[PDB]
């Protein structure tokens with residue numbers, strides 16, 4: 872249902888979190904177009920202490936490379 | 938399966954995710970549900986009782 876990166880949560884802006892055997896992706900509801908989890912696809916709100924079933928994972932950042 | 942079984946083949950989905958999607962359809966962000974889940978479940982049980 873969510874991802875806890877740094878003591879926070881990351882809910883999908885529009886779509887669902889889907890994982891194959893190893894890696895994670897965010898995709899549309901009615902099609903299969905996987906994308907890499909970036910800070911644009913997610914909005915942060917919470918503390919990842921009350922969410923049930925959260926996973927740790929990691930979220931990339933587009934600002935740091937440039 | 939939510940509402941998908943009325944259009945095409947039935948597709949599985951966990952119930953809390955379905956309620957999150959239903960909240961997302963009346964202009965309320967989904968993070969409301971996942972932060973207040975036990976209270977909502979208790980309210981639903983009391984209402985159905």
Ligand SMILES: *[C@@H]1O[C@H](CO)[C@@H](O[C@@H]2O[C@H](CO)[C@@H](O[C@@H]3O[C@H](CO)[C@@H](O)[C@H](O)[C@@H]3O)[C@H](O)[C@H]2NC(C)=O)[C@H](O)[C@H]1NC(C)=O
Pocket residue numbers: 891892893894
């Ligand atoms: C779950 O999906 C991910 C996303 O595609 C899969 O990871 C990707 O797997 C492919 C196939 O092994 C990798 O391509 C390979 O890259 C190496 C160079 O590292 C190249 O030598 C091979 O010829 C091949 O092109 C791809 O790199 C990899 N993605 C990442 C980010 O590393 C994953 O395999 C899927 N799960 C399972 C169980 O297959």
Ligand SMILES: *[C@@H]1O[C@H](CO)[C@@H](O[C@@H]2O[C@H](CO)[C@@H](O)[C@H](O)[C@H]2NC(C)=O)[C@H](O)[C@H]1NC(C)=O
Pocket residue numbers: 926927
């Ligand atoms: C996700 O990250 C958190 C934060 O580090 C992990 O929680 C800690 O896990 C270590 C290792 O078991 C414990 O020693 C700490 O006491 C934990 N801290 C808290 C506040 O819980 C958590 O285990 C990680 N989860 C996964 C699945 O990797």
